[PDB]
Design a protein around this nucleic acid. Structure first.
Ligand SMILES: [Zn+2]
Ligand SMILES: [Zn+2]
Ligand SMILES: [Zn+2]
Ligand SMILES: [Zn+2]
Lengths: 84, 76
DNA sequence: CTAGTTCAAAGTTCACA
DNA sequence: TGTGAACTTTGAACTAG
């Protein structure tokens, strides 16, 4: 055999996870995206058909689909706090 | 028991006052590092569970007004 | 006597076509 | 523009005895 060092991946985009953010294992990108969205109650529109692939290379291509994938994966809006 | 500073659930007496783990930690740190804050608004920010972290000056002042004593916190 | 600590998960910044 | 890597506080859980 061989020794295993624990790696977590983003449940939104499959990128390497910096830990759990807002209730789910996510990267710094998806954490920041979700924060900014929730902070100003931003709403987006999918230019395609609400089924855009959300991965490291595609995540920035559709804010709508990225946001719905955050919620579908269990990211909690109530875990986003007020400004400091 | 409720936290006399923010109204959250109190974990018991801390530095003379019934407070939450948040106000304990925040008061401990403020004293240790001898921190000075400045209010962003008008020295009368509402301090409660959801708003406690919005202004450190008004929280520290509510910590003193509710009776927290600096001399209770360990120095170095 | 009536205190102490840790560190994940909250926060915020700022370089870049 | 809006992103995300790299940073600063916070507070739930727990410590010694
Ligand atoms: Zn991600
Ligand atoms: Zn889409
Ligand atoms: Zn409190
Ligand atoms: Zn204030």
């Amino acid at each position: 055999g061989s020794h295993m060092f624990t790696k977590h991946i983003c449940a939104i985009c499959g990128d390497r996870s910096s830990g759990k953010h807002y209730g789910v294992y996510s990267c710094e990108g998806c954490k920041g995206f979700f924060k900014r969205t929730v902070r100003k109650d931003l709403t987006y529109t999918c230019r395609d058909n609400k089924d855009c692939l959300i991965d490291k290379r595609q995540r920035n291509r559709c804010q709508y689909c990225r946001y719905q994938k955050c919620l579908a994966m269990g990211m909690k809006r109530e875990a986003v706090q007020e400004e400091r």
